[PDB]
Amino acid sequence: TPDREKALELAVAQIEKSYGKGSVMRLGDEARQPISVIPTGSIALDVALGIGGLPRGRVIEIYGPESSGKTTVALHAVANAQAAGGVAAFIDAEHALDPDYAKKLGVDTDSLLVSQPDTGEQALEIADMLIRSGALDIVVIDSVAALVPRAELEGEHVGLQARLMSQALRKMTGALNNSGTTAIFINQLTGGKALKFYASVRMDVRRVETLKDGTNAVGNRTRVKVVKNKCSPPFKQAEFDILYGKGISREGSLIDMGVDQGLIRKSGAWFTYEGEQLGQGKENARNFLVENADVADEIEKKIKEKLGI
């Protein structure tokens, strides 16, 4: 029992030495807090990720169905990275991006670098050239499935989209570590059978139920599961709202995590905080914290403190 704990601690130690700092963890463990992370938009998701957001210098994969929220999540990462004086690229083989939307989340679309590559190979290469500059904080690739190989596009065997992904990632991982740039690969349901193993974080994004606005019904309760996480115990999940043309309700996630930690009391429909009242029902409580940014930062401050960061 006492002679065991050492052999295990020893075992865990040489594993970390041989393969890296997150190669083994107990699921109950507190997270190793890095210097800087890219916040995701939802404090719940930031907390579910352990390190308060996305890791820098690593490969992230965000996947899920059509219109599930993955891209929304990705754009927030882009917004936050910029808000911190960072530069961001967007490799687009999908041609789906709505910048007016991106802009409302907080993306500085004017300074957003975009590329609409001719081929899968070119997409990844252009992304690599960008990464090896050292000037990028984040780059998003929309999407994996769209990374069609030159050969296929030129009418010329089958299965080389995977070889392409595999080859690219090998190179890209080293370049991402050195630069400290984060790559977000958006993926559906591909060639990302490699992506699965190169990724430090993998997020399963899904729509749970549609938010009611008196019968109009615009907005979605989004659920994300961190199915892989090399930077903190994995398998944590989070919920948060994405609102029609507004993105993730930062304030909505503040309340939810707020009550979760007991920092926000909930006597009936009344959400309460530090003796004062925030609103009756979640909508007013949400609407309160947006028109009162002072208290929203207070609550955000208190939540980070009570947890890791």
Tab-separated table of N, CA, C and O in Angstrom, residues 43-124:
chain	number	residue	atom	x	y	z
A	43	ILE	N	-17.556	30.246	-20.216
A	43	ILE	CA	-16.794	29.888	-19.015
A	43	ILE	C	-16.986	28.401	-18.654
A	43	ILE	O	-16.041	27.733	-18.208
A	44	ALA	N	-18.197	27.885	-18.877
A	44	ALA	CA	-18.490	26.472	-18.647
A	44	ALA	C	-17.553	25.577	-19.449
A	44	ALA	O	-16.946	24.656	-18.904
A	45	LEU	N	-17.435	25.867	-20.739
A	45	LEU	CA	-16.534	25.135	-21.624
A	45	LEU	C	-15.073	25.366	-21.249
A	45	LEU	O	-14.270	24.437	-21.288
A	46	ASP	N	-14.733	26.605	-20.902
A	46	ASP	CA	-13.390	26.928	-20.428
A	46	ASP	C	-13.033	26.095	-19.202
A	46	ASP	O	-11.903	25.611	-19.074
A	47	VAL	N	-14.004	25.935	-18.308
A	47	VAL	CA	-13.822	25.121	-17.111
A	47	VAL	C	-13.775	23.626	-17.459
A	47	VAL	O	-12.973	22.869	-16.894
A	48	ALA	N	-14.623	23.207	-18.394
A	48	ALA	CA	-14.671	21.814	-18.812
A	48	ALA	C	-13.369	21.411	-19.489
A	48	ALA	O	-12.973	20.248	-19.445
A	49	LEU	N	-12.706	22.376	-20.114
A	49	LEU	CA	-11.410	22.141	-20.728
A	49	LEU	C	-10.277	22.081	-19.709
A	49	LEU	O	-9.170	21.647	-20.038
A	50	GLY	N	-10.530	22.546	-18.489
A	50	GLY	CA	-9.548	22.442	-17.410
A	50	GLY	C	-8.596	23.617	-17.345
A	50	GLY	O	-8.433	24.215	-16.294
A	51	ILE	N	-7.972	23.957	-18.468
A	51	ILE	CA	-7.011	25.056	-18.507
A	51	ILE	C	-7.637	26.416	-18.840
A	51	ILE	O	-6.937	27.351	-19.228
A	52	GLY	N	-8.952	26.529	-18.684
A	52	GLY	CA	-9.653	27.802	-18.880
A	52	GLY	C	-9.809	28.259	-20.318
A	52	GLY	O	-10.057	29.430	-20.563
A	53	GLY	N	-9.687	27.344	-21.269
A	53	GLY	CA	-9.720	27.709	-22.684
A	53	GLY	C	-8.875	26.768	-23.514
A	53	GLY	O	-8.487	25.697	-23.049
A	54	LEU	N	-8.583	27.158	-24.746
A	54	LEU	CA	-7.848	26.277	-25.631
A	54	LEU	C	-6.353	26.409	-25.419
A	54	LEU	O	-5.858	27.506	-25.183
A	55	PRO	N	-5.628	25.284	-25.518
A	55	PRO	CA	-4.181	25.320	-25.379
A	55	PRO	C	-3.515	25.967	-26.582
A	55	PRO	O	-3.998	25.830	-27.703
A	56	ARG	N	-2.412	26.666	-26.337
A	56	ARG	CA	-1.625	27.276	-27.405
A	56	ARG	C	-0.586	26.300	-27.915
A	56	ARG	O	-0.126	25.435	-27.179
A	57	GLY	N	-0.219	26.446	-29.180
A	57	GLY	CA	0.812	25.609	-29.786
A	57	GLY	C	0.423	24.159	-30.011
A	57	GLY	O	1.295	23.308	-30.165
A	58	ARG	N	-0.884	23.884	-30.035
A	58	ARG	CA	-1.420	22.523	-30.157
A	58	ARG	C	-2.470	22.428	-31.260
A	58	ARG	O	-2.951	23.430	-31.774
A	59	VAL	N	-2.831	21.201	-31.595
A	59	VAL	CA	-3.885	20.928	-32.553
A	59	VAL	C	-5.202	20.697	-31.803
A	59	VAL	O	-5.296	19.828	-30.939
A	60	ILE	N	-6.207	21.502	-32.123
A	60	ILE	CA	-7.550	21.311	-31.595
A	60	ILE	C	-8.374	20.735	-32.732
A	60	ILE	O	-8.180	21.111	-33.888
A	61	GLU	N	-9.268	19.805	-32.398
A	61	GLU	CA	-10.302	19.355	-33.326
A	61	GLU	C	-11.665	19.638	-32.727
A	61	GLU	O	-11.949	19.185	-31.625
A	62	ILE	N	-12.510	20.361	-33.456
A	62	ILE	CA	-13.900	20.563	-33.050
A	62	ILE	C	-14.828	19.942	-34.094
A	62	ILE	O	-14.856	20.376	-35.234
A	63	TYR	N	-15.586	18.925	-33.704
A	63	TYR	CA	-16.460	18.249	-34.640
A	63	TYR	C	-17.895	18.141	-34.164
A	63	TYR	O	-18.204	18.341	-32.993
A	64	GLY	N	-18.769	17.802	-35.101
A	64	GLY	CA	-20.195	17.713	-34.849
A	64	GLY	C	-20.971	17.819	-36.143
A	64	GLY	O	-20.380	17.949	-37.209
A	65	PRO	N	-22.303	17.751	-36.064
A	65	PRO	CA	-23.115	17.835	-37.268
A	65	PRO	C	-23.145	19.217	-37.902
A	65	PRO	O	-22.595	20.165	-37.353
A	66	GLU	N	-23.785	19.297	-39.065
A	66	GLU	CA	-24.047	20.559	-39.751
A	66	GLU	C	-24.751	21.523	-38.787
A	66	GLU	O	-25.688	21.135	-38.081
A	67	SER	N	-24.266	22.763	-38.733
A	67	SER	CA	-24.875	23.809	-37.910
A	67	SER	C	-24.957	23.458	-36.423
A	67	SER	O	-25.844	23.937	-35.725
A	68	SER	N	-24.036	22.637	-35.933
A	68	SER	CA	-24.082	22.202	-34.534
A	68	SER	C	-23.566	23.258	-33.554
A	68	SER	O	-23.999	23.291	-32.399
A	69	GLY	N	-22.642	24.105	-34.012
A	69	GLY	CA	-22.038	25.138	-33.161
A	69	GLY	C	-20.522	25.186	-33.234
A	69	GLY	O	-19.911	26.203	-32.926
A	70	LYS	N	-19.910	24.085	-33.641
A	70	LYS	CA	-18.457	24.017	-33.794
A	70	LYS	C	-17.802	25.296	-34.351
A	70	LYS	O	-16.866	25.821	-33.752
A	71	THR	N	-18.289	25.797	-35.482
A	71	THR	CA	-17.710	27.003	-36.089
A	71	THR	C	-17.908	28.217	-35.199
A	71	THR	O	-16.980	29.000	-35.006
A	72	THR	N	-19.115	28.378	-34.666
A	72	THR	CA	-19.367	29.407	-33.659
A	72	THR	C	-18.302	29.361	-32.565
A	72	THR	O	-17.640	30.361	-32.292
A	73	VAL	N	-18.122	28.188	-31.965
A	73	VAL	CA	-17.086	28.007	-30.957
A	73	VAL	C	-15.741	28.481	-31.498
A	73	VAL	O	-15.038	29.251	-30.840
A	74	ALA	N	-15.400	28.029	-32.701
A	74	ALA	CA	-14.127	28.383	-33.327
A	74	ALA	C	-13.951	29.901	-33.510
A	74	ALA	O	-12.879	30.450	-33.255
A	75	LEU	N	-15.009	30.575	-33.941
A	75	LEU	CA	-14.946	32.013	-34.176
A	75	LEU	C	-14.703	32.787	-32.883
A	75	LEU	O	-13.953	33.764	-32.884
A	76	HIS	N	-15.321	32.352	-31.786
A	76	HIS	CA	-15.027	32.945	-30.476
A	76	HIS	C	-13.546	32.821	-30.140
A	76	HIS	O	-12.912	33.807	-29.775
A	77	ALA	N	-12.989	31.621	-30.285
A	77	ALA	CA	-11.552	31.447	-30.097
A	77	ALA	C	-10.801	32.487	-30.913
A	77	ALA	O	-9.890	33.128	-30.399
A	78	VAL	N	-11.202	32.673	-32.173
A	78	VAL	CA	-10.579	33.693	-33.033
A	78	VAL	C	-10.767	35.088	-32.413
A	78	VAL	O	-9.790	35.820	-32.249
A	79	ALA	N	-11.997	35.429	-32.027
A	79	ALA	CA	-12.280	36.733	-31.404
A	79	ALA	C	-11.386	37.010	-30.187
A	79	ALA	O	-10.702	38.037	-30.114
A	80	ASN	N	-11.389	36.084	-29.237
A	80	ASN	CA	-10.615	36.254	-28.013
A	80	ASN	C	-9.128	36.406	-28.289
A	80	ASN	O	-8.474	37.252	-27.690
A	81	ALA	N	-8.608	35.593	-29.204
A	81	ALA	CA	-7.190	35.627	-29.561
A	81	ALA	C	-6.819	36.981	-30.126
A	81	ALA	O	-5.718	37.470	-29.899
A	82	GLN	N	-7.744	37.587	-30.864
A	82	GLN	CA	-7.525	38.918	-31.421
A	82	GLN	C	-7.615	39.960	-30.329
A	82	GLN	O	-6.737	40.804	-30.211
A	83	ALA	N	-8.674	39.882	-29.523
A	83	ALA	CA	-8.885	40.820	-28.418
A	83	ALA	C	-7.650	40.911	-27.542
A	83	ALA	O	-7.440	41.912	-26.873
A	84	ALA	N	-6.833	39.861	-27.557
A	84	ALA	CA	-5.557	39.850	-26.854
A	84	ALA	C	-4.412	40.259	-27.781
A	84	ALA	O	-3.271	39.856	-27.577
A	85	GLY	N	-4.717	41.054	-28.800
A	85	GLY	CA	-3.704	41.533	-29.742
A	85	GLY	C	-3.068	40.488	-30.639
A	85	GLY	O	-1.966	40.697	-31.154
A	86	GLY	N	-3.761	39.370	-30.844
A	86	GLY	CA	-3.269	38.292	-31.707
A	86	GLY	C	-3.727	38.416	-33.152
A	86	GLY	O	-4.649	39.178	-33.469
A	87	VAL	N	-3.072	37.664	-34.030
A	87	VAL	CA	-3.443	37.614	-35.433
A	87	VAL	C	-3.995	36.230	-35.719
A	87	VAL	O	-3.538	35.255	-35.135
A	88	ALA	N	-4.983	36.155	-36.609
A	88	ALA	CA	-5.680	34.906	-36.891
A	88	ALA	C	-5.865	34.667	-38.380
A	88	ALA	O	-6.145	35.588	-39.125
A	89	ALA	N	-5.717	33.418	-38.803
A	89	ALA	CA	-5.996	33.026	-40.176
A	89	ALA	C	-7.205	32.094	-40.232
A	89	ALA	O	-7.553	31.452	-39.241
A	90	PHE	N	-7.836	32.031	-41.400
A	90	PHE	CA	-8.991	31.168	-41.623
A	90	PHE	C	-8.843	30.463	-42.970
A	90	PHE	O	-9.054	31.069	-44.012
A	91	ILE	N	-8.469	29.188	-42.947
A	91	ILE	CA	-8.331	28.409	-44.174
A	91	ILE	C	-9.707	27.838	-44.505
A	91	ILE	O	-10.239	27.003	-43.765
A	92	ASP	N	-10.266	28.284	-45.625
A	92	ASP	CA	-11.666	28.035	-45.955
A	92	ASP	C	-11.802	27.244	-47.239
A	92	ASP	O	-11.633	27.789	-48.322
A	93	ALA	N	-12.113	25.959	-47.109
A	93	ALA	CA	-12.415	25.107	-48.256
A	93	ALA	C	-13.913	24.816	-48.328
A	93	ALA	O	-14.351	23.989	-49.135
A	94	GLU	N	-14.689	25.507	-47.491
A	94	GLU	CA	-16.127	25.274	-47.350
A	94	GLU	C	-16.947	26.429	-47.950
A	94	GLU	O	-18.024	26.219	-48.505
A	95	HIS	N	-16.418	27.643	-47.839
A	95	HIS	CA	-17.048	28.861	-48.377
A	95	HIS	C	-18.370	29.172	-47.673
A	95	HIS	O	-19.289	29.720	-48.275
A	96	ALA	N	-18.429	28.850	-46.381
A	96	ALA	CA	-19.657	28.957	-45.587
A	96	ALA	C	-19.670	30.144	-44.634
A	96	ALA	O	-20.708	30.466	-44.072
A	97	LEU	N	-18.523	30.779	-44.439
A	97	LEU	CA	-18.388	31.791	-43.395
A	97	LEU	C	-19.276	33.004	-43.641
A	97	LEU	O	-19.326	33.534	-44.753
A	98	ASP	N	-19.973	33.415	-42.581
A	98	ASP	CA	-20.758	34.647	-42.533
A	98	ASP	C	-20.012	35.657	-41.641
A	98	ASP	O	-19.979	35.494	-40.415
A	99	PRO	N	-19.408	36.701	-42.249
A	99	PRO	CA	-18.598	37.620	-41.457
A	99	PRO	C	-19.437	38.535	-40.583
A	99	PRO	O	-19.012	38.866	-39.486
A	100	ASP	N	-20.613	38.941	-41.045
A	100	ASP	CA	-21.478	39.761	-40.203
A	100	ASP	C	-21.717	39.063	-38.865
A	100	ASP	O	-21.674	39.704	-37.809
A	101	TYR	N	-21.943	37.748	-38.920
A	101	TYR	CA	-22.064	36.931	-37.717
A	101	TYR	C	-20.782	36.983	-36.928
A	101	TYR	O	-20.791	37.335	-35.758
A	102	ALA	N	-19.678	36.646	-37.582
A	102	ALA	CA	-18.377	36.636	-36.934
A	102	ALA	C	-18.122	37.945	-36.217
A	102	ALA	O	-17.645	37.957	-35.091
A	103	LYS	N	-18.464	39.040	-36.881
A	103	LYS	CA	-18.254	40.386	-36.350
A	103	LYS	C	-19.025	40.602	-35.048
A	103	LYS	O	-18.486	41.172	-34.108
A	104	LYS	N	-20.271	40.141	-34.985
A	104	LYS	CA	-21.079	40.297	-33.767
A	104	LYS	C	-20.570	39.484	-32.567
A	104	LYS	O	-20.779	39.884	-31.428
A	105	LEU	N	-19.929	38.343	-32.821
A	105	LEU	CA	-19.285	37.555	-31.757
A	105	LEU	C	-18.107	38.310	-31.172
A	105	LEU	O	-17.754	38.123	-30.005
A	106	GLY	N	-17.483	39.135	-32.007
A	106	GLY	CA	-16.318	39.900	-31.616
A	106	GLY	C	-15.107	39.676	-32.491
A	106	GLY	O	-14.009	40.095	-32.124
A	107	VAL	N	-15.284	39.025	-33.641
A	107	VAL	CA	-14.173	38.825	-34.572
A	107	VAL	C	-13.850	40.134	-35.271
A	107	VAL	O	-14.740	40.835	-35.753
A	108	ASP	N	-12.567	40.455	-35.316
A	108	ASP	CA	-12.082	41.576	-36.091
A	108	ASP	C	-11.882	41.059	-37.512
A	108	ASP	O	-10.771	40.684	-37.902
A	109	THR	N	-12.969	41.019	-38.278
A	109	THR	CA	-12.935	40.401	-39.604
A	109	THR	C	-12.018	41.142	-40.569
A	109	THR	O	-11.378	40.517	-41.413
A	110	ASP	N	-11.939	42.461	-40.430
A	110	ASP	CA	-11.048	43.270	-41.260
A	110	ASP	C	-9.593	42.801	-41.201
A	110	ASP	O	-8.923	42.746	-42.230
A	111	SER	N	-9.106	42.458	-40.011
A	111	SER	CA	-7.726	41.963	-39.873
A	111	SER	C	-7.607	40.436	-39.942
A	111	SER	O	-6.496	39.901	-39.876
A	112	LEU	N	-8.735	39.747	-40.115
A	112	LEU	CA	-8.740	38.290	-40.266
A	112	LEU	C	-8.126	37.894	-41.592
A	112	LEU	O	-8.588	38.322	-42.632
A	113	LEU	N	-7.083	37.078	-41.547
A	113	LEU	CA	-6.458	36.553	-42.756
A	113	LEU	C	-7.271	35.368	-43.251
A	113	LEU	O	-7.556	34.443	-42.491
A	114	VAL	N	-7.646	35.398	-44.523
A	114	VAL	CA	-8.446	34.336	-45.095
A	114	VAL	C	-7.741	33.765	-46.310
A	114	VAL	O	-6.989	34.453	-46.998
A	115	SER	N	-7.974	32.483	-46.546
A	115	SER	CA	-7.448	31.812	-47.706
A	115	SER	C	-8.466	30.768	-48.169
A	115	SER	O	-9.030	30.040	-47.355
A	116	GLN	N	-8.716	30.721	-49.471
A	116	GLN	CA	-9.669	29.782	-50.039
A	116	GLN	C	-8.935	28.861	-51.010
A	116	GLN	O	-8.997	29.051	-52.218
A	117	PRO	N	-8.242	27.846	-50.470
A	117	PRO	CA	-7.225	27.130	-51.219
A	117	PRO	C	-7.787	26.306	-52.348
A	117	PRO	O	-8.950	25.928	-52.327
A	118	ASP	N	-6.938	26.018	-53.321
A	118	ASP	CA	-7.341	25.260	-54.496
A	118	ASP	C	-7.475	23.777	-54.169
A	118	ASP	O	-8.312	23.100	-54.746
A	119	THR	N	-6.655	23.279	-53.246
A	119	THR	CA	-6.610	21.853	-52.947
A	119	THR	C	-6.324	21.611	-51.484
A	119	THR	O	-5.838	22.497	-50.790
A	120	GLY	N	-6.609	20.395	-51.031
A	120	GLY	CA	-6.263	19.958	-49.681
A	120	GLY	C	-4.792	20.172	-49.351
A	120	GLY	O	-4.470	20.762	-48.328
A	121	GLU	N	-3.902	19.700	-50.221
A	121	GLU	CA	-2.464	19.925	-50.035
A	121	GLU	C	-2.131	21.400	-49.879
A	121	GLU	O	-1.420	21.783	-48.948
A	122	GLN	N	-2.642	22.224	-50.785
A	122	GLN	CA	-2.374	23.665	-50.735
A	122	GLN	C	-2.906	24.289	-49.438
A	122	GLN	O	-2.248	25.134	-48.828
A	123	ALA	N	-4.095	23.860	-49.028
A	123	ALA	CA	-4.702	24.336	-47.792
A	123	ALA	C	-3.742	24.166	-46.622
A	123	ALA	O	-3.438	25.126	-45.910
A	124	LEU	N	-3.254	22.944	-46.447
A	124	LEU	CA	-2.387	22.616	-45.325
A	124	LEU	C	-1.017	23.284	-45.432
A	124	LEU	O	-0.473	23.751	-44.428
